[PDB]
Amino acid sequence: QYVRIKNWGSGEILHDTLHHKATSDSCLGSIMNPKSLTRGPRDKPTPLEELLPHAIEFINQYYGSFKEAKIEEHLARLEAVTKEIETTGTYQLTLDELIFATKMAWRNAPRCIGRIQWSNLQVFDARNCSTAQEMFQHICRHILYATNNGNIRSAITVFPQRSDGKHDFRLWNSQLIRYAGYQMPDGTIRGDAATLEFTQLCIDLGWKPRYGRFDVLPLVLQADGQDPEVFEIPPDLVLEVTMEHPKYEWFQELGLKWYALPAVANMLLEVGGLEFPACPFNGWYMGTEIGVRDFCDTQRYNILEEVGRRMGLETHTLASLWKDRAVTEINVAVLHSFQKQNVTIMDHHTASESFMKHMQNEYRARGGCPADWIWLVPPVSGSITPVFHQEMLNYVLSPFYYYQIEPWKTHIWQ
Amino acid sequence: QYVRIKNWGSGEILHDTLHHKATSDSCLGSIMNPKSLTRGPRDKPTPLEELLPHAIEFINQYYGSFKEAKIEEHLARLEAVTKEIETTGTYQLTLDELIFATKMAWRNAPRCIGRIQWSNLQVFDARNCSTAQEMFQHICRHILYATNNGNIRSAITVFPQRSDGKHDFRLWNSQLIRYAGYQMPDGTIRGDAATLEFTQLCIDLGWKPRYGRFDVLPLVLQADGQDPEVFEIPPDLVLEVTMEHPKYEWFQELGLKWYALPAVANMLLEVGGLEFPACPFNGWYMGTEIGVRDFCDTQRYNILEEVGRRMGLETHTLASLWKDRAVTEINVAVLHSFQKQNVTIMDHHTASESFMKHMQNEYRARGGCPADWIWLVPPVSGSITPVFHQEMLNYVLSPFYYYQIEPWKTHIWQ
Numbered sequence A, B: 001q002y003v004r005i006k007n008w009g010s011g012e013i014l015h016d017t018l019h020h021k022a023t024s025d026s027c028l029g030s031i032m033n034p035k036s037l038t039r040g041p042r043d044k045p046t047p048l049e050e051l052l053p054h055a056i057e058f059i060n061q062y063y064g065s066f067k068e069a070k071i072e073e074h075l076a077r078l079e080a081v082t083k084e085i086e087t088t089g090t091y092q093l094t095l096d097e098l099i100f101a102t103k104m105a106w107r108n109a110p111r112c113i114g115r116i117q118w119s120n121l122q123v124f125d126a127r128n129c130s131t132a133q134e135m136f137q138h139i140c141r142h143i144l145y146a147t148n149n150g151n152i153r154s155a156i157t158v159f160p161q162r163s164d165g166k167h168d169f170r171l172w173n174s175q176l177i178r179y180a181g182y183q184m185p186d187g188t189i190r191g192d193a194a195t196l197e198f199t200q201l202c203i204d205l206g207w208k209p210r211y212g213r214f215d216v217l218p219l220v221l222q223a224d225g226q227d228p229e230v231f232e233i234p235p236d237l238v239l240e241v242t243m244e245h246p247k248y249e250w251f252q253e254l255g256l257k258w259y260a261l262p263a264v265a266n267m268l269l270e271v272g273g274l275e276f277p278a279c280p281f282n283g284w285y286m287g288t289e290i291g292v293r294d295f296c297d298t299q300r301y302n303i304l305e306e307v308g309r310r311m312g313l314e315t316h317t318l319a320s321l322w323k324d325r326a327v328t329e330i331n332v333a334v335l336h337s338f339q340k341q342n343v344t345i346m347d348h349h350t351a352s353e354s355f356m357k358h359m360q361n362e363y364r365a366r367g368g369c370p371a372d373w374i375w376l377v378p379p380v381s382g383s384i385t386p387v388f389h390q391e392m393l394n395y396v397l398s399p400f401y402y403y404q405i406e407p408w409k410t411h412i413w414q
């Protein structure tokens, strides 16, 4: 009938009718969460006719990985998997395979810019977990492991695989550590205007809103299949950076900071026909993420305005390019602040040179590298980056990390 | 077998094998000149079975345009077109329809950011032209019309439609006005490193290389179907801007300038099953095009280096973000210089706010608006722009402006 289109800034929506009158040459791409990139809910198990092939595939890819194969272990493992499936109607990955699977899936992420690290990954095997308190506990160890007092370390903690689908493990937060946003009496909006909806949810589930500009939202875990249980993150576990500029000292007066730990908590890991609906993973920030996206967007903190004011810049003439000047300085701050407070970080420029290196090793390696230009090209200083002038194909391989329908929209409350 | 991928910066190339192992979810998008966006050569005419439908379509769209239709003129015109086709095996558009066609095609350009102007367009009917000298003459009037002493005006001059295909009108230059690039003895490269190839071609066709950093390349027109004939542009016809910064006065010392007129000369206009392989069109510059792309790219002038030097900035620490600071100032120059020397121009920020307005009027209007996010989002200060957070569908409608195989690659020299 028509296609919905959102504008994450103004949150406005439009319905596209025109495409219908398209030609015999409707590309999506420009879409945030497309269905071609999602792996939603389930009711029943995973039809063996499907599971079995994919299961085999993965296993072949796995043993077809190591130098000088283990032909026998390859066959042996093959057999065992087959046998196990036709006995329980599914199968468990060895830890070494899961590890392979986690790194591959990452390596195969069209939208990750630091994939050149793909081999360095910490795998926490949480597949035995069983309760919310156990989740909450593992999330903590991970956070603590990854934060590593500022010297960040990429990790991942793989909870229980999806069985029937009515017994799914799901972290309800978009990310491990993320400030909350309330809508002040006076109509304003403190904190992260982005998490308005989820913050409410947190309240609705009993969270005590410390109404502030930087409140680190509570973990909202659901295990096995039960309702989600609210948990607060141990204030000690969350390492933050206080924003200060190496020049404009009025900058810290701004009262700005941000968490050092970027961990995606609502993605789904698919491998060998299996899928884990909960498996938080973390890397480390790329400057422009905090400086550009989080601080400047109109749907977040939106600080661009006064940061230019305090620079003298004419905040009434777009043509004056103050915004360009402001943002620039904001980013120099973040890079400074992090740098100073010894919290690992990457400026968008070096990031790109390294991805390019990566991309190249990736083609010589397996003749290819899935990339989503749109996402990969830094939000500012684009054509000043190598990747901007680099054509790239975007495709879904496997293993892979799929988005997935927001849990509240698909739950069974009792 | 495999897909070639170019990196316009380093001009390097890679062959993608991986996509083959893709999944049942290969998107191109990130491609400059895809074949889905091109309309190449021909040998024979355009099969009537095809022409006739499209011809009708267009005509219906055309009369279905004006408020309170001219039902009779609609039918009458319909008839006449039909009659004309089955008598000559093709048909001529009225000027009013061509005009409609030129504005629509523009309006339908997924990659143009100023489409909000789509209704303001000057149409020069050059369909009677017959010789290279006549082309050269019309190109001149257009240039002069459009340049309008700095107060720029968007125009288009539609040469002869493709007949058989062995009688095509083709301007061999990528654009109406564009500096030439030579590769100096000392291995260096003066001028626009981008036009190396075409500059040579110009020599090879008898052009006298005034070996310089800003030499405006000669028109290379081919008419009816003959070989291309070289023509020099009347130095008086090319209005340029000398780059000077409203602060750093060492800036003009840089010896920088750029032409005020952006006109695309090698695109093909397709409308009602007809196609014109030559029809230059011009609008006016969007700052960041000159400041970011043309001056900074490594495949163009590549000035980023010393522009930071002269700012004190540490040109040895990427992390220092000097580049970000440099570019910013370069753009402030261009905007200044143009502004000062009364040459119309648009800063990327206002550009975006206006396109957004446009896009919106465009959906309420005909429920839709084809856009190529990748191209539309300014090369710098992306997420600082509305369009960055605006999902958009990219599709090919008609009329439309298609790229087309580079003429030299497909010619018949005698």
Ligand code: HEM
Pocket (backbone or CB within 6 Å): A102, A106, A109, A111, A112, A113, A114, A115, A117, A121, A154, A155, A156, A264, A267, A281, A282, A283, A284, A285, A286, A289, A346, A375, A401
């Ligand atoms: C070397 C440390 C890393 C850096 C600097 C890094 C950086 C980035 C950046 C800049 C983005 C795009 C920004 C955005 O998501 O809004 C991104 C996306 C992504 N990264 Fe990473 N990454 C790192 C490690 C990882 C690891 C270890 C994984 C998986 C175990 C991963 C998985 C992803 C995925 C799945 C996305 C796309 C998320 C989405 O769709 O929103 N990244 N990364």
Ligand code: HEM
Pocket (backbone or CB within 6 Å): B102, B106, B109, B111, B112, B113, B114, B115, B117, B121, B154, B155, B156, B264, B267, B281, B282, B283, B284, B285, B286, B289, B346, B375, B401
């Ligand atoms: C209101 C004045 C105009 C402005 C500011 C403008 C601006 C732009 C910009 C910024 C781009 C992308 C940059 C690039 O091509 O590398 C673009 C692309 C384009 N514009 Fe315009 N434009 C204007 C008028 C026009 C007109 C009048 C036409 C057709 C009669 C047109 C046709 C196109 C096409 C076909 C493209 C894509 C070119 C390509 O594929 O390389 N534009 N325009």
Ligand SMILES: COc1ccnc(CCc2nc3cccnc3[nH]2)c1
Pocket (backbone or CB within 6 Å): A174, A175, A262, A263, A264, A281, A282, A283, A284, A285, A286, A289
């Ligand atoms: C997994 O490694 C990394 C490293 C750097 N960045 C990320 C992005 C995750 C993320 N998604 C988000 C959506 C909204 C607000 N913040 C967000 N962070 C992930």
Ligand SMILES: COc1ccnc(CCc2nc3cccnc3[nH]2)c1
Pocket (backbone or CB within 6 Å): B174, B175, B262, B263, B264, B281, B282, B283, B284, B285, B286, B289
């Ligand atoms: C038609 O109106 C406009 C307005 C502003 N910009 C353009 C781009 C055309 C163009 N394509 C190019 C390719 C290489 C070098 N310069 C180029 N200019 C076109």
Ligand SMILES: C[C@H](O)[C@H](O)[C@H]1CNc2nc(N)[nH]c(=O)c2N1
Pocket (backbone or CB within 6 Å): A388, A389, A390, A391, A392, B008, B029, B030, B031, B032, B374, B375, B376
């Ligand atoms: C590889 C990539 O497609 C290429 O660098 C594109 C990106 N976006 C662009 N956008 C505009 N407006 N103009 C360009 O020339 C490009 N180049």
Ligand SMILES: C[C@H](O)[C@H](O)[C@H]1CNc2nc(N)[nH]c(=O)c2N1
Pocket (backbone or CB within 6 Å): A008, A029, A030, A031, A032, A374, A375, A376, B388, B389, B390, B391, B392
């Ligand atoms: C509409 C558009 O898809 C959206 O704004 C995208 C563009 N590119 C992005 N790129 C990254 N890295 N992160 C994002 O959140 C986005 N947002």
